[PDB]
Amino acid sequence: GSRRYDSRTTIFSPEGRLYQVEYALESISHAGTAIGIMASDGIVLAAERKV
Amino acid sequence: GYDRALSIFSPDGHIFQVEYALEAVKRGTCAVGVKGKNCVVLGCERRSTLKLQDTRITPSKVSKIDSHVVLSFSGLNADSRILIEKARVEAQSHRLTLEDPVTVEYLTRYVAGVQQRYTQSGGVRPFGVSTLIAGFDPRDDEPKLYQTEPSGIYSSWSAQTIGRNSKTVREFLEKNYDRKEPPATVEECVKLTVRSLLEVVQTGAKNIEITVVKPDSDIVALSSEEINQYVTQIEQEKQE
Amino acid sequence: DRGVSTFSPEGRLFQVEYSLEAIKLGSTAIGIATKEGVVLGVEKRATSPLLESDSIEKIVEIDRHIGCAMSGLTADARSMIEHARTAAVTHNLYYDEDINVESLTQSVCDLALRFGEGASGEERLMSRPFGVALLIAGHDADDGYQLFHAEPSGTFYRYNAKAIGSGSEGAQAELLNEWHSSLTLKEAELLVLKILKQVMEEKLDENNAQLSCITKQDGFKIYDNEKTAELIKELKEKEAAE
Amino acid sequence: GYDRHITIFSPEGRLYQVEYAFKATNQTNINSLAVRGKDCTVVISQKKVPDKLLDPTTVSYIFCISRTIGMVVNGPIPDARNAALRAKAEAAEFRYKYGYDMPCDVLAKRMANLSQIYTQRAYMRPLGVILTFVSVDEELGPSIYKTDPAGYYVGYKATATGPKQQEITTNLENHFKKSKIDHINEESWEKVVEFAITHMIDALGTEFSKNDLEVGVATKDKFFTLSAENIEERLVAIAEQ
Amino acid sequence: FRNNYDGDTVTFSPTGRLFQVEYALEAIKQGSVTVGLRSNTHAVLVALKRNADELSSYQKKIIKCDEHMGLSLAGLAPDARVLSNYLRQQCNYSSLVFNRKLAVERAGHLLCDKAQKNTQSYGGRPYGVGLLIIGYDKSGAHLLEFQPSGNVTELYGTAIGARSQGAKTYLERTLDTFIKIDGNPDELIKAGVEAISQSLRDESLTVDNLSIAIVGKDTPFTIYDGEAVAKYI
Amino acid sequence: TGYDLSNSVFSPDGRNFQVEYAVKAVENGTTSIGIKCNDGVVFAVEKLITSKLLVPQKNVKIQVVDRHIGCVYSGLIPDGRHLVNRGREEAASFKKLYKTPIPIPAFADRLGQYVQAHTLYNSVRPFGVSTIFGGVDKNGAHLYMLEPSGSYWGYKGAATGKGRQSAKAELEKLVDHHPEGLSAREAVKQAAKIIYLAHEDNKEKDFELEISWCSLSETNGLHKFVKGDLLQEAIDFAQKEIN
Amino acid sequence: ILYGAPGTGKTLLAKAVANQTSATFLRIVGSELIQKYLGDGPRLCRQIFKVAGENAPSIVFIDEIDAIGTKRYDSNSGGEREIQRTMLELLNQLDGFDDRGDVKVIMATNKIETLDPALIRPGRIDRKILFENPDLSTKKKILGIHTSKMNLSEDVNLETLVTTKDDLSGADIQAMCTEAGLLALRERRMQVTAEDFKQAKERVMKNKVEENLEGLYL
Amino acid sequence: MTDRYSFSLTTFSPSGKLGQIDYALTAVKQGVTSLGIKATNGVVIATEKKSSSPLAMSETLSKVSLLTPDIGAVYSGMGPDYRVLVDKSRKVAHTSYKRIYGEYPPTKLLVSEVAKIMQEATQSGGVRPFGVSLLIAGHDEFNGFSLYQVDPSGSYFPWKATAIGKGSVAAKTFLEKRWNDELELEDAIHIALLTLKESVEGEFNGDTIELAIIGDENPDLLGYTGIPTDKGPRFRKLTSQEINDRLEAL
Amino acid sequence: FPLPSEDSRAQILQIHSRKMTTDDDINWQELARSTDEFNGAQLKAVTVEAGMIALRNGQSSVKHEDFVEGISEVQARKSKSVSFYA
Amino acid sequence: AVGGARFDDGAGGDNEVQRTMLELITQLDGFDPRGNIKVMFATNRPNTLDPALLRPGRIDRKVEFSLPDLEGRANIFRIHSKSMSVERGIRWELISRLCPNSTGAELRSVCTEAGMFAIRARRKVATEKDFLKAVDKVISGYKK
């Protein structure tokens, strides 16, 4: 709740999920959108860039 | 205040961090199993709600430790694969030293010891994923079902329900199941196990993974049509 | 504010104060040391019929003639169990003799009274203080039947009748009177069950109650389900006459 | 200060440990001057006079690392003696491994690299003093390299340590501008001290006696510190010219 | 004074005296109490054993370290146990290399530097147990009073524990009594029983309560119990 | 402020508050003085008597480094004994290598790098004691006192403790008696009376006079304890001047 | 003591008990019990039991307490000094009031941790109502009321609407029936067909109520 | 201000980006302005130097060092941060390459190893990140000329024209619109002198300004003669006296 | 006006003993060792709590031994809950 | 609610509590003997009063109210069982044993709630199982 220790990964959060993992998904969305494609005859990879 | 360290026993006699580890299990996958006289059955729940997901390349929840000993966890998949990997290393180390197959009692003390050493060690996070260790003793058909808890303790149960809605399914296992006379046949233990899983799964097929363990080091995995076959038998009374 | 090493100008302890509360939340461990034998018992705490009553045990056998009782957190206890088992074969390896109960109790308490990673004049094993308490009994060639209590805080004490766990304050009230030096083996078995039944919430049977006995002839022997039920029937006969 | 508890760059981009590191240099309130002749380098430090319980001869703000090499430290004393014993170790070890005379350029550069190690260790305190190293190079000749508490080192024609450095630089800037050279005339090292005393008194605005000052002299392959009687001879030598 | 300083034992107080010594001093006051004195030819310590209840046996506060050297335990138990093996190792090291028994003044110095390193170190567990060390060497009998701060002093005798003021007053008026008695260990033990009885409110006066251990030129250090100490009581 | 929590902290005043309180802890102890003569040095320290149970010539804090250096400190007793035991190993390691007695100005550099580095370290607590050491080395007589902050210089006299201010006025009078200073036995008689004068603050309890000196005249470079008629004469010398 | 959200557990449960008891519903605003003035706190509390204490015709009901429930430590930061004297004196009115149960006091608050343990006085209040998630039978009883006057097509049944549900409360299910009727006005008909419920369940539980059920153990 | 967890290098930032990284650029921004211009036939670098006292030696400060004869470097920031970094970087370049492949490290391999030290400086606790930003210019036989902007966070990216320090944002728009990739190195030197002059107009001479370029080999700087195979050093650092000759032709 | 010292409170407790009726065997210098951080007003409350020890000791008057037990704590604090070894 | 001073009196112009402290000083201390006339207060916190009254000479004894022990909580339940119909074969010692230290109200709640569980089972008296569920209702429902 009000008391949160994000410093060490060893400290368990009151919700049960580490807060470093929560905001790590935001850094993923802050970057460019990358789309993987798995095909039968190969793999198609298309992605943008952040800069 | 007292949730920032593992070295404090807390004023309530229980570490709050251990209780928070159970919250991830309550929101995680479900693990339900019941052992019979000659066999043990371990069910689980794999979430298929994610679209465009290949079930063939996705490893099943039930992992193979020993020929006659399997394992099924409930919780986050990230911390569970380490508990499976560390157990497999000791599973092979038993034959490297004692030459005998994996003992269910010895394997549980090691898996519980993994969470034990990391809990006692300061600055190291333990595992908050509860695992169910089942199997047969060497040259013995007597099933042995053990569990692991975030508190660093192990308890032996004939039938146990963990995960989401653990208390709701537990009421089903304390009435139709009898420890004094467990089901002798394999079909009776598997058919009743599916009915207990239909509560958390709520009419699904690929969301149920059941691995039946047989003596003489035998592992069989029911297919999607074989698992759904027992679902029709349980739901037959509702459509009759 | 707590602060561990930093106290108030009054000065109780912290990890020990939290240890006493964790011990009182564990299982009830009752035992009595007499001249003809030492009988121990524990409350398994069965919350459901699906929970085994013989696979898990809170009474570990350190030696054939030397038993032990465990009430508290089992996680930090197994570190002391393997240390007590190592100390058992230690005295057998070096001196080729059965270690005395008082000598073995002090050897086990050597690890419980120290902690910390930093080492100066002694090796370090425990990374953090452990609050697990143990009841060490047995028989030796000098003091005979002896019963001690392993305290991680201070030095162990010699108790003739000791009860820890949630049944500590409840059982010790009757141990200051009914205890006597002339109590035989049969009288000691009925005295424990009489007190154990009053300090236990559930009914008394072989499922939720498992006792043990320590003698010289039979060593460490655990009462089976058939022998325990016979002592329960003898307990109801004595309570009905009184 | 929520972010003030530690040594990092802070949200304002300003190191607050350097803020109090420079303030500790003026705690002793000692003003020194370092000048360089053509063939020689002469440094002068102000020697404070304590009560009768202390020996002023034993009090020195200038330490001798080796011959021709010297160190002028203005700041906290306990950090000066610990850095003096450390600076001598690198001087002797460099003459062994590399077998060469350690120049004041590297000697100030080594202390600059060692200063970051102090900041890199959270349990170790950075140097809160002012390290001024002077020597006479075989090639470059006289050179002054002063290592700031933050690790900055750069050559100086005439440097100073103290609050009066603003007035010291002004008087010494026009002196070197008219002659268009950074060296003092009268190549004889005995006459160089005469100018170093003259330009210092007018810059500081306060004349001092032999017991209020100390004068080091770094020549080629030789170094020595003038005693109380030798400093008195310098004041008499100024009148004779 | 709540917080504002003294995170660990390293932080000094505004007065200049670490309050962690007073925190460990309460464990000595709340712990067992012992009374002892010495003379030129003899040294004796009378320890009062403690227990929990009637079913709990009294534990001896005197642990044997050296043949000619002994002490008593008043303070925290885990602090005195580690120091027991440290002092005994130095007695065996002195009996190995130097081959002579460890001196009293030398035992107190190694004990002082043992707890001084952990005190100046970051964090740690400083030793808060009080120790009264007696012994006989070529220099004669001596008695050292150990404090949780590490201070070591020499006295004819003293008392550390609960209600230690009563024995301190008795030793001031009787100071000239036990120092003039040499070669008679009986009179020194009789003075020790009357010394601890004055310092106590007299809870339990029985025999198993007191533990007497005396060392001297002829008779070495020996712990007496049972009928051995019942003659004086 | 919050800068006193631990070591390795730069205060706005230029010196740590823990070091400031360590200096004030020295003023809470006893009075230890010293006199540096031409042929040697004289040490004088006062030991506070707790009660009549104290045995004389037991707790004396006078230590001897090699044969030519005496050692005395004023401050925390347990913290002071740890520095003397380590300081002896520093002077011994010099003889274990160079095979010669250690000079005094070099003996101060070993304690300097030892104590001053600990003030820079957080894990190690700085020393709150002031150690006074001196003697006669191959070069001559030298006297150096180690401050709790780590700074030291040559000292013609030693003043520390609570009565250092009252003793400072008496040490400066030595110039008035003679321009070259007193003799070896005259310095012991003069330093003794200073202890009786500084006792006015500690007069609530008793004291035991402790004086030691090392010179090349009588002991020929040995550091011994003052006894015999020299100790009794220094005691009666102050009783007549106070009267 | 009441918990949950207004309109469902803090409203329906209050008005449902007053119906069967045949008593008048008397609502008292909890935030109005504190006038931040000395003497008005105990005055308004004693007058509550006075109007209901003659013939006991009605029952006292109190809802939506964000104020007197939390006194903090001070008259600032959301608390008030008059709350300390009001709650402490209200305890005397609870013990002094005695009847056979014709008059009850029902108060609603979000958290009882900020309440005064004196005013609580366990054994005076034995009733604690925790908000429970609606079951399968909850939505079926809400639909039957509105579907009585709303004609349903042949493809609309009882088990069809309850097949996919987040266990919305009895009030939120009413909003789903209104959205199904709103789509019927677009096609100009009074009988809601099965195609409207498919688009209504997606709008109500997503567009009209933003949840989305954030996953990954949250 | 908000959360210290962004400042802790052992803790992930609640805002998604470590506050220690963004505020370390402020320390770099507080420093002087350094830039670079990448052309087809060469890469020019220019920066302004600290004047300090009027009696301070201008020849002592050198902000352009020598890594390999084909690769130059320039930095803006604290003095010791660049020294300790490169003193170790020169050892890693020799150990991981010259002690294996027996040559001078190329552009892609050398720059990648420089950022790895900054990665450990921003990872392990207690070690503060560097307060400098290195602009590395080099030429090899594979990728050719390259200009990489190395930030203290440990992430490097190629840039044709870039600037750091206080004039980072100001000169970035200038160098973007003024400079084109199709120009040569001769026009790159004149543009670098005009953009750097906008920082301070007090002294533009070689005393406070250092200038160095990359390009083909120089036979006078090789040190030995008689071997046609081995080319001379590709990096040439212009003397402050020679810089004034370029300024007169500007 | 800081908190009185150890010997500073010995003269204050001496005057408080003269206002009441005692055995006159009390030495004010010995009782000053058990007092920690007390002012002139707090010492008046200590003399009131010290006289209550005479009731527990069964004495008509208040002797010197009744003060020693009353000056230490004999009020609140952490009491007997933790003593010796728990 | 009174104390030694308040806002409307100490900080205000009106005199009510400001004149109340006079009656606790002039009358009690000066005129009234200490033996016959005594004064006792009740407060939640000592700091809510006037520091002038907390000084020695008037307010000295501070009585802290602890909670009943196993023996104290057992004697309270047996008294409430006289006015409440229960089973003659129950035990009040085991009832107070499961419940931790509780206030005077929390102990009365165990007896009052014991009759509520008997309504579900439709019994005229409260058996031992009713008291066990009443203790768990206090432990789980509060957790304080």
End-to-end CA distance of chain E: 46
Sign of CA dihedral G115, G116, G121, G124: negative
In chain E the beta strands, taken as DSSP E runs, fall at 34-38, 42-48, 62-64, 69-74, 130-137, 140-146, 152-154, 157-160, 210-216, 222-224
The phi and psi torsions of F225 (rounded to 5 degrees) equal -105, 145
What is the domain count for chain B? 1
Q: Which residues pair with C212 in a beta bridge?
A: C40, C222
- Using alpha carbons, select from F85, B110, G111, G58 the residue that is nearest to residue E105: F85
**What b-and-e string marks burial along D198-225, b requiring 16 or more CB atoms within 10 Å of the CB?**
ebbeebbeeebebeebbbbbbbeeebeb
Solved with:
cryo-EM
How close does chain C come to I15, measured CA to CA in Å? Answer: 29
Which residues of I touch chain E, with CB atoms under 8 Å apart?
A: 30, 33-34, 68, 82-85
Do D and F have ≥3 inter-chain CB pairs under 8 A? yes
User: Which residue of chain D comes nearest to F34, CA vs CA?
Assistant: D53
G193 among annotated binding-site residues? no
Q: What is the residue type of F27?
A: E
How close does chain H come to D53, measured CA to CA in Å? Answer: 40
Give contacts of H15 with chain A, Cβ < 8 Å.
23
- D159: how many CB neighbours lie within 10 A of its CB? 28
Q: Are strands H145-150 and H156-158 parallel, antiparallel or unpaired?
A: antiparallel
Return d(Cα E106, Cα E69) in angstroms, integer: 12
Q: Do G217 and A17 touch (CB under 8 A)?
A: yes
G78 among annotated binding-site residues? no
The CA-based angle B23-B27-B30, given to 5 degrees, is: 110
Query: What 3-state class would DSSP assign to C150?
Result: strand
- B142: how many CB neighbours lie within 10 A of its CB? 12
Do I and C have ≥3 inter-chain CB pairs under 8 A? yes
What is the domain count for chain C? 1
Q: Do J109 and G123 touch (CB under 8 A)?
A: yes
Return d(Cα C189, Cα C36) in angstroms, integer: 12
Instruction: Kindly compute the dihedral angle of the four CA atoms of residues J39, J42, J43, J48, in this order, to the nearest 10 degrees.
Output: -20
* CATH number of the domain encompassing residue B55: 3.60.20.10
The phi and psi torsions of E70 (rounded to 5 degrees) equal -150, 165
Return d(Cα B32, Cα B130) in angstroms, integer: 12
Q: Do E82 and C179 touch (CB under 8 A)?
A: no
- Using alpha carbons, select from H164, H216, H195, H194 the residue that is nearest to residue H40: H216
- Using alpha carbons, select from H46, H32, H71, H58 the residue that is nearest to residue H210: H46
The phi and psi torsions of D63 (rounded to 5 degrees) equal -105, 145
User: Which residue of chain G comes nearest to J106, CA vs CA?
Assistant: G122
Return d(Cα C142, Cα J29) in angstroms, integer: 70
Return d(Cα C102, Cα C215) in angstroms, integer: 16
- Using alpha carbons, select from B116, B119, B102 the residue that is nearest to residue B153: B116
How close does chain B come to A1, measured CA to CA in Å? Answer: 11
Q: Pick the residue of C6, C30, C108 with the most E CBs within 10 A to test the interface with E by mutation.
A: C6
Q: Which residues pair with A34 in a beta bridge?
A: A47
**What b-and-e string marks burial along I21-43, b requiring 16 or more CB atoms within 10 Å of the CB?**
ebeeebebeebbebbeebeeebb
Q: Which residues pair with F142 in a beta bridge?
A: F135
Return d(Cα E79, Cα C122) in angstroms, integer: 12
- F186: how many CB neighbours lie within 10 A of its CB? 17
- Using alpha carbons, select from E18, D78, C11 the residue that is nearest to residue F78: E18
Any idea which residue has 């320290």 for tokens? F45
Give contacts of B55 with chain A, Cβ < 8 Å.
none
Return d(Cα G49, Cα G34) in angstroms, integer: 17
- Residue J48 gets which letter from DSSP? G
Q: What Cα–Cα distance (Å) separates residue E68 from each residue in C218, D195, J126? A: 44, 76, 71
Q: Pick the residue of A8, A12, A18 with the most B CBs within 10 A to test the interface with B by mutation.
A: A12
Give contacts of A17 with chain G, Cβ < 8 Å.
216-218
Q: Which pairs from J90-97 meet CB under 8 Å and 24+ separation?
A: J90/J127, J90/J128, J90/J131, J91/J128, J94/C201, J94/J128, J95/J128, J95/J131, J95/J132, J95/J135, J96/J70, J97/C170, J97/J70
Cα R_g (chain A), whole angstroms: 17
- Using alpha carbons, select from H70, H69, H43 the residue that is nearest to residue H160: H43
Return d(Cα J109, Cα G121) in angstroms, integer: 9
Q: What is the 3-state secondary structure (H, E, C) of chain G?
A: CECCCCCCCCCHHHHHHHHHCCCEEEEEECHHHCCCCCCHHHHHHHHHHHHCCCCCCEEEEEECECCCCCCCCCCCCCCCHHHHHHHHHHHHHHHHCCCCCCCCEECEECCCCCCCHHHHCECCECCCCCCCCCCHHHHHHHHHHHHHHCCECCCCCHHHHCCCCCCCCHHHHHHHHHHHHHHHHHCCCCCECHHHHHHHHHHHHHHCCCCCCCCCCC
Q: Are strands G58-63 and G105-106 parallel, antiparallel or unpaired?
A: parallel
Q: Which tokens hold the place of B237? A: 């009374």
The phi and psi torsions of C62 (rounded to 5 degrees) equal -80, -40
Q: Do H7 and D8 touch (CB under 8 A)?
A: yes
Q: What is the residue type of B206?
A: K
Instruction: Catalogue all structural domains in chain F, each as residue range(s) with its CATH number.
Output: 1-243 (3.60.20.10)
Specify whether the backbone of E192 is left (phi greater than 0), alpha (psi in -120 to 50) or beta. alpha
Return d(Cα D47, Cα D60) in angstroms, integer: 7
How close does chain D come to H53, measured CA to CA in Å? Answer: 8
Q: Which tokens hold the place of D120? A: 């890199």
Return d(Cα G185, Cα G204) in angstroms, integer: 17
**What b-and-e string marks burial along G136-165, b requiring 16 or more CB atoms within 10 Å of the CB?**
eebbeebbeeebeebebeeebeeeebbeeb
Resolution in A: 7.5
Q: Which tokens hold the place of C86? A: 């190592």
Which residues form the domain of B113? 1-240
In chain D the beta strands, taken as DSSP E runs, fall at 32-36, 41-46, 62-66, 69-74, 130-136, 142-147, 153-155, 159-161, 213-219, 222-225
Sheet holding B143-147, edge to edge: B63-64, B69-74, B130-136, B143-147
Q: Pick the residue of J61, J62, J67 with the most I CBs within 10 A to test the interface with I by mutation.
A: J61
List, as one string, the DSSP characters of chain H: ---GGGT-TTS--TTSS-HHHHHHHHHHHHS--EEEEE-SS-EEEEEE----STTB-TTT-----EEETTEEEEEES-HHHHHHHHHHHHHHHIIIIITTT-S---HHHHHHHHHHHHHHHTTSTTPPPPS-EEEEEEE-SSS-EEEEEE-TTS-EEE-SEEEESTTHHHHHHHHHHH--TTS-HHHHHHHHHHHHHTT--S--STTTEEEEEE-S--GGGSS--S-SSS---SEEEEPHHHHHHHHHT-
CA D162 to chain centre: 11
Q: Do C11 and I78 touch (CB under 8 A)?
A: yes
Q: Which residues pair with D136 in a beta bridge?
A: D142
Which of F14, F120, F156 faces D23 most closely, judged by CB atoms? Answer: F14
Q: Are strands H161-164 and H209-214 parallel, antiparallel or unpaired?
A: unpaired
Return d(Cα B128, Cα B151) in angstroms, integer: 9
- Residue D9 gets which letter from DSSP? -
G163 among annotated binding-site residues? no
Do G and I have ≥3 inter-chain CB pairs under 8 A? no
- Using alpha carbons, select from C57, C8, D44, A4 the residue that is nearest to residue B153: C57
**What b-and-e string marks burial along A7-46, b requiring 16 or more CB atoms within 10 Å of the CB?**
ebebbbbbbbbbbbebbeeeeeeeeeeeeeeeeeeeeeee
Cα R_g (chain G), whole angstroms: 22
Which residues of J touch chain C, with CB atoms under 8 Å apart?
A: 70, 94, 97-98, 132
Return d(Cα G79, Cα D159) in angstroms, integer: 64
Residue D147 near chain H (CB below 8 Å): no
Q: What Cα–Cα distance (Å) separates residue G198 from each residue in G154, G190, H81? A: 15, 17, 65
- Find the length of chain I: 86
- Residue J24 gets which letter from DSSP? I
Sign of CA dihedral E102, E104, E109, E111: positive
Query: What 3-state class would DSSP assign to C233?
Result: helix
Q: Do J7 and G38 touch (CB under 8 A)?
A: yes
Q: What Cα–Cα distance (Å) separates residue E198 from each residue in E172, E195, F50, H225? A: 13, 5, 21, 103
- Using alpha carbons, select from E167, E100, E99, E101 the residue that is nearest to residue E132: E167
Which of E31, E165, E169 faces I84 most closely, judged by CB atoms? Answer: E31
Q: Are E74 and E170 in contact (CB under 8 A)?
A: no
User: Which residue of chain G comes nearest to B50, CA vs CA?
Assistant: G215
Which of H5, H8, H16 faces A27 most closely, judged by CB atoms? Answer: H16
What is the domain count for chain E? 1
Q: Are F70 and F179 in contact (CB under 8 A)?
A: no
* CATH number of the domain encompassing residue H39: 3.60.20.10
Q: What is the residue type of C234?
A: E
G11 among annotated binding-site residues? yes
- Using alpha carbons, select from E194, E206, E207, E121 the residue that is nearest to residue E159: E194
The CA-based angle C148-C151-C157, given to 5 degrees, is: 35
**A window 15-34, beta carbon within 8 A of H:** 19-20, 23-24, 26-27, 30
Return d(Cα G168, Cα G162) in angstroms, integer: 10
Query: What 3-state class would DSSP assign to F131?
Result: strand
The CA-based angle D98-D100-D106, given to 5 degrees, is: 85
For the packed helices G170-186 and G194-202, what is the interaxial angle rounded to 10 degrees?
Answer: 120
* CATH number of the domain encompassing residue C169: 3.60.20.10
- Using alpha carbons, select from H22, H4, H28 the residue that is nearest to residue H130: H28
Q: Hey, which chains touch A, using 3+ CB pairs under 8 Å?
A: B, G, H
Return d(Cα E79, Cα E115) in angstroms, integer: 10
Query: What 3-state class would DSSP assign to C79?
Result: helix
Q: Which residues pair with C30 in a beta bridge?
A: C41, C163
Return d(Cα C94, Cα C91) in angstroms, integer: 5
List, as one string, the DSSP characters of J65-93: -----HHHHHHHHHHHHHHS-B-TT--HH
User: Which residue of chain G comes nearest to J7, CA vs CA?
Assistant: G38
Instruction: Kindly compute the dihedral angle of the four CA atoms of residues C19, C24, C28, C30, in this order, to the nearest 10 degrees.
Output: 70
For the packed helices J128-142 and J104-121, what is the interaxial angle rounded to 10 degrees?
Answer: 120
List, as one string, the DSSP characters of F195-216: HHHHTTTTTTS-EEEEEEEEES
- H181: how many CB neighbours lie within 10 A of its CB? 9
Q: What Cα–Cα distance (Å) separates residue G179 from each residue in E73, G168, G199, G203? A: 82, 15, 9, 8
**I window 53-82, beta carbon within 8 A of C:** 77-78, 81-82
Q: What Cα–Cα distance (Å) separates residue G81 from each residue in C102, C104, G118, G121? A: 63, 63, 16, 21
- Using alpha carbons, select from I30, I19, I41, I40 the residue that is nearest to residue I72: I30
Give contacts of I85 with chain E, Cβ < 8 Å.
31, 50, 77
Q: Which residues pair with H36 in a beta bridge?
A: H45, H162
CATH 3.60.20.10 fits D1-241, yes or no: yes
Give contacts of G216 with chain A, Cβ < 8 Å.
17, 21, 25
Q: Pick the residue of E6, E12, E17 with the most F CBs within 10 A to test the interface with F by mutation.
A: E12
Query: What 3-state class would DSSP assign to D10?
Result: coil
Q: Hey, which chains touch B, using 3+ CB pairs under 8 Å?
A: A, C, G
Which residues form the domain of E55? 3-233
Any idea which residue has 């059920």 for tokens? G213
Residue A5 near chain H (CB below 8 Å): no
G140 among annotated binding-site residues? no
G122 among annotated binding-site residues? no
The phi and psi torsions of D71 (rounded to 5 degrees) equal -130, 125
User: Which residue of chain E comes nearest to I37, CA vs CA?
Assistant: E1
The residues of F that are catalytic are: 30
Q: What Cα–Cα distance (Å) separates residue D134 from each residue in D81, D141, D143, D187, G163? A: 18, 11, 6, 18, 89
Dmax (CA) of chain C: 63
